[PDB]
Design a protein around this ligand. Sequence first.
Ligand SMILES: COc1ccc(C2=N[C@@H](c3ccc(Cl)cc3)[C@@H](c3ccc(Cl)cc3)N2C(=O)N2CCNC(=O)C2)c(OC(C)C)c1
Lengths: 86, 9
Amino acid sequence: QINQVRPKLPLLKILHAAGAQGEMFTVKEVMHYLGQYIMVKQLYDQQEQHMVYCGGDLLGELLGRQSFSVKDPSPLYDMLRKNLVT
Amino acid sequence: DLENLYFQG
Ligand SMILES: COc1ccc(C2=N[C@@H](c3ccc(Cl)cc3)[C@@H](c3ccc(Cl)cc3)N2C(=O)N2CCNC(=O)C2)c(OC(C)C)c1
């Protein structure tokens, strides 16, 4: 009930950068703050707003990707599986 | 579903 997670340190830093506070979050809050992160760092393509260009951002480092489409988010799944504890 | 978790407006 409420599956609280503790983001690993690099991911926590991304969430803080997006306005998050503390170090324990619901998965939903994590996704909220990751979206916000992308908005406020303008990592998305204003012309094709589903495409994220994360390469050379810490986020791209975490994902192991230069880019991803929110339309095909397997990379995000892989990354969150590895970087959210309990 | 993370897309669903996110979009529960
Ligand atoms: C047509 O343009 C769109 C369509 C859908 C999304 C989107 N889709 C949502 C989403 C996507 C995939 C998953 Cl697995 C979960 C949630 C969520 C989101 C959550 C986390 C990440 Cl890392 C990226 C995006 N998410 C968003 O964060 N959006 C949508 C609503 N509000 C926003 O500020 C941006 C989108 O996000 C940008 C941040 C890239 C742009």
